[PDB]
C-alpha cells in the first residue's frame, strides 16, 4: 500500500477481487441448498422403494 497512488488502486484490486470470494461462497451456499433438496427427494425415493 505504502504509496497513495497504490492506496486507491489497491481499493480497485480488492474491490473486483473480494467479490470473487463471495461469488464462490454464493455458489457453494446454493450448492448446499441443492444438497438439501436432493436429500429431501432422496429419502422419499428410499421410502417409496
Amino acid at each position: 500500500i505504502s504509496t497513495a497512488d497504490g492506496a486507491q488502486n489497491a481499493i480497485a484490486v480488492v474491490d473486483n477481487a473480494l467479490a470473487a470470494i463471495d461469488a464462490q461462497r454464493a455458489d457453494l451456499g446454493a450448492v448446499q441448498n441443492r444438497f438439501k433438496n436432493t436429500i429431501d427427494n432422496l429419502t422419499n425415493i428410499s421410502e417409496n422403494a
Binding site: 473480494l18 467479490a19 463471495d22 461462497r25
Partner: protein, 49 residues
C-alpha cells in the same frame, strides 16, 4: 449483498476517521496562520510607525 454492504459500512467508518483527521489538520493550518497573521499585522504596524 451483506458482504459488499458490510465492507461499504466499514469504509464509511474509516472515512469518518479520515475526514475528522482532515478537520484537525486544517485546524493546525488555521492556527499557524493565525500566528503568522498576527505577525504580519504587526509588521504592517511597524511600517506605519
Amino acid at each position: 449483498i451483506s458482504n459488499r454492504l458490510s465492507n461499504q459500512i466499514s469504509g464509511l467508518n474509516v472515512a469518518t476517521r479520515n475526514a475528522n483527521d482532515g478537520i484537525s489538520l486544517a485546524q493546525t493550518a488555521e492556527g499557524a496562520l493565525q500566528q503568522s497573521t498576527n505577525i504580519l499585522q504587526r509588521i504592517r504596524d511597524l511600517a506605519l510607525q
